[PDB]
Structure formats: C-alpha cells, structure tokens
C-alpha cells in the first residue's frame, strides 16, 4: 500500500527538477516531504556535503540517514514495476558514500600510512590526490609545515589531522574541518 509511511524526506544541493521528481515520487510512496530541514526529518538526500543542511545532520542528528539522489527514483521504479519490496526499502543500498565529492591530499605522513589512507579514501567513495591542486577539498597534514601545507593555507583549502578521516568514516558523514585543526 504505502511503503514509505513514517518517512520524512528532505533534500540538500539537489537541482529543482530532481527535487520535484523526488518530492512527487516519495509522496506517492507514502512519505512526507519537507523543504525546510525540520525536526521530524528522517532521511536527507544530499548532492554535496558543503551545505548547512548536511552540516547540521552531521553535527547533531546521527539518527538521520544521508541518502544518494537516486534512492527515491530507484525505489519508485521498483515499486511501480510491481516488484516486492523488503523491509529495508533499499535504504542501505543507496546510502550516500561517506566521502562523496571529497578530494583528499596528504602531506608529512610516512609510508606505510600513506598507502593505508589512500585505501580508505577510495573505499568510502572519495578521490585520492597525490598532488595538491586548487580543487582538493581536504589536505591531511601530519604537521603544519611544508609546501603542500603552505599553499593549502594560501588557497583556503581545509587542513586537518588524519583523525578527520577516521572519525568521518565512523560517523558515516563528512565532518567539519575545524573539529580536526592542527595544534
């Protein structure tokens, strides 16, 4: 009858057209839809991590599931084809990757730590960057010196300790950089 009864869905950094598609199909599935991020939101469909909505969910609402943009269209298509939906409602198969849109660079960290960090960045949906460029989102710095570090500061790129990575992975969300500032 209504597979998404009890769900309350909100979007962040989703283009208006795809937002209307999600809004209409989620409502058809029995969910409620919110344009504002209200207290009763249960699922946040996100197209970026650098938004006030994403940041609030990551900071304060671990109960809220952060979903990729194709979750509702895929779920809707399966239902409208009369396929049988299990209890999970495909939520786990369409969680947004933890490091979605992250481009991670490193400095002042030895081997074998460098190889391990790259492994986990890729495993959680991010891009690993051997060179620092202007579109790097996070520079993991073992200490606050060297050319990568100085130019990250010049270019206004986040500089964090490696605990940013481990705790973002454990939290299943990108955490804000000031929580992981050096010194």
């Amino acid at each position: 009858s209504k597979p998404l009864k009890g769900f309350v869905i909100c979007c962040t950094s989703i283009d208006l057209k795809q937002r209307t598609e999600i809004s209409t199909k989620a409502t058809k599935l029995g969910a409620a839809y919110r344009s504002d991020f209200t207290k009763d939101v249960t699922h946040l469909i996100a197209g970026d991590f650098d938004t006030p909505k994403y940041k609030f969910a990551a900071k304060s609402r671990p109960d809220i599931k952060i979903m990729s943009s194709e979750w509702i269209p895929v779920l809707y298509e399966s239902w409208v084809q009369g396929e049988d939906l299990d209890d999970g409602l495909l939520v786990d198969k369409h969680l947004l990757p933890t490091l979605f849109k992250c481009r991670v660079c490193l400095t002042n960290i030895g081997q074998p730590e460098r190889s391990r960090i790259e492994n986990y960045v890729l495993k959680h949906g991010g891009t690993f960057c051997p060179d620092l460029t202007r579109d790097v989102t996070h520079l993991i710095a073992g200490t606050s010196s060297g050319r990568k570090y100085e130019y990250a500061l010049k270019w206004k790129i986040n500089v964090v300790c490696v605990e940013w990575l481990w705790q973002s992975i454990q939290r299943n969300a990108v955490l804000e950089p000031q929580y992981f500032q050096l010194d």
């Binding site: 209200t38 009763d40 006030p52």
Partner: peptide
Amino acid sequence: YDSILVQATPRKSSSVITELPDTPI
C-alpha cells in the same frame, strides 16, 4: 514536529550578468 532546524536553500537571485561565454564550437 515542524520546528525549522535549517532553512531551505534560497533560490539564487537573477544576478547581474558580468561575462558572456565564448561561442561553443
């Protein structure tokens, strides 16, 4: 509960045009 934690992202203003792109090839 409809208390607003974070407001919806505002639709961007028209913004005065300052650049016209190279004609695509």
